[PDB]
Amino acid sequence: KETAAAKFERQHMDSSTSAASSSNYCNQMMKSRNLTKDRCKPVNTFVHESLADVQAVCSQKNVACKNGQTNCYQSYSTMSITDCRETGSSKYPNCAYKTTQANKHIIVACEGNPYVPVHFDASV
Ligand SMILES: O=c1[nH]cnc2c1ncn2[C@@H]1O[C@H](COP(=O)(O)O)[C@@H](O)[C@H]1O
Ligand SMILES: O=c1[nH]cnc2c1ncn2[C@@H]1O[C@H](COP(=O)(O)O)[C@@H](O)[C@H]1O
Ligand SMILES: O=c1[nH]cnc2c1ncn2[C@@H]1O[C@H](COP(=O)(O)O)[C@@H](O)[C@H]1O
């Protein structure tokens, strides 16, 4: 039922806040977006921009994906993001995360028709 595009929105879109600036944010969000269900997702980024702005990245700077595929795109502008990284002492199911805010260019992979983000590759 859940499309790749919907999964990208679930894992990575958080337009509601301008910057994920609670120290609790990743702990709460990693759980509520179901990224700690079968295991602690080791790293995940949330993007605090409009869906339209993030979708627009698929028409921006074409760059090589980490996996060597050619369908990745880097945002021309920096975007407000939050990096969530599993702590060294995090143990499933009690997944624990460090919350870090940044403004960085995002790199996403795009697929499909319509051509939309389906994977978050990197922030630079
Ligand atoms: O949400 C995500 N999905 C997939 N990869 C991510 C996500 N967020 C960050 N990353 C990548 O994971 C890296 C951290 O892992 P590292 O290679 O051990 O340093 C970051 O530099 C990002 O490129
Ligand atoms: O490029 C892609 N297209 C569709 N699904 C992907 C792609 N890359 C990874 N996935 C899968 O969907 C999830 C994407 O998470 P992300 O890499 O953090 O964005 C991963 O857990 C993979 O299982
Ligand atoms: O200019 C860049 N090229 C490639 N990765 C970058 C760059 N700037 C920041 N990064 C981030 O740093 C990670 C690579 O660092 P590494 O794990 O030490 O190899 C990537 O996952 C990116 O998210």
Residue 39 backbone dihedrals phi, psi, to 5 degrees = -175, 170
Q: Is 25 in the pocket of ligand 2 (CB under 6 A)?
A: no
Tokens of 58: 């698929």
Approach to solving = X-ray
What is the CA angle 95-117-96, rounded to 5? 10
Q: Which helix (H) or strand (E) holds 12?
A: helix 4-12
Please report, in angstroms and rounded to a whole number, the separation of the first and last CA atoms in the chain: 32
Tokens of 43: 């790293």
Of 26, 24, 37, 30, the residue nearest 10 (C-alpha)? 30
Whether residue 87 is annotated as binding a ligand: the answer is: no
Sign of CA dihedral 24, 29, 35, 41: negative
Resolution as reported, in Å: 1.5
Q: For the chain, state the CA radius of gyration.
A: 14
Q: Which helix (H) or strand (E) holds 84?
A: strand 79-86
What residue spans define the domains of the chain? Answer: 1-124
Give the CATH H-level superfamily of domain 1-124: Ribonuclease A-like domain (3.10.130.10)
Whether residue 85 is annotated as binding a ligand: the answer is: yes
